[PDB]
UniProtKB/TrEMBL annotation, chains B, D, E:
This is Transmembrane protein gp41. It is a single-pass type I membrane protein. The gene is env. It is found in: Virion membrane; Host cell membrane; Host endosome membrane. Signal peptide: none annotated.
Length: 36, 32, 36, 32, 32, 36
């Protein structure tokens, strides 16, 4: 119960980590592309 | 400049879908 | 109730706007890449 | 031509997930 | 090398959202 | 019932097809970019 609901909400932690990464890469990429 | 503006577009949809999922998991836990 | 269910269905409007944008950029990008 | 063919691939998954979400929100409202 | 590392980043989020959806469809069918 | 639940789980088949495609393109693209 409020163990599984733990596991699922804190996978949904991991995905909001993945969507971190992607925001950071989006910023690096913009800057880096402006410089080329 | 378009391929990267669309990485952002996709990132924005994914991020909205995440929030929408969270409201959906909320409805389910709200019916238990 | 059929206020929240408004807010959520018409965010899900906004996302189907974001997925608009992305379809339009996908088309512009194809054409533009064929020309390079 | 591959990076852009994969922008499309991702766009297609996101769009399917959106429809799948809508069917899920439908189930929840169908149980209220 | 960054635009493609972010195709992967997006692919990874989409794939996690898919699994998370499946657990959500599971909750709904578990309440029927 | 266990017809609709068929349709939906086996769309969710199709999406896990789309996420196939994208994994395969991600691999082709990495390799191909290393070679340029």
């Amino acid at each position: 119960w409020e163990x599984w609901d733990x596991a699922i909400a804190e996978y949904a932690x991991r995905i909001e980590x993945l969507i971190x990464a992607a925001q950071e890469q989006q910023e690096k990429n913009e800057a880096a592309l402006r410089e080329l | 400049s378009g391929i990267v503006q669309q990485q952002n577009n996709l990132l924005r949809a994914i991020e909205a879908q995440q929030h929408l999922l969270q409201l959906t998991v909320w409805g389910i836990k709200q019916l238990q």
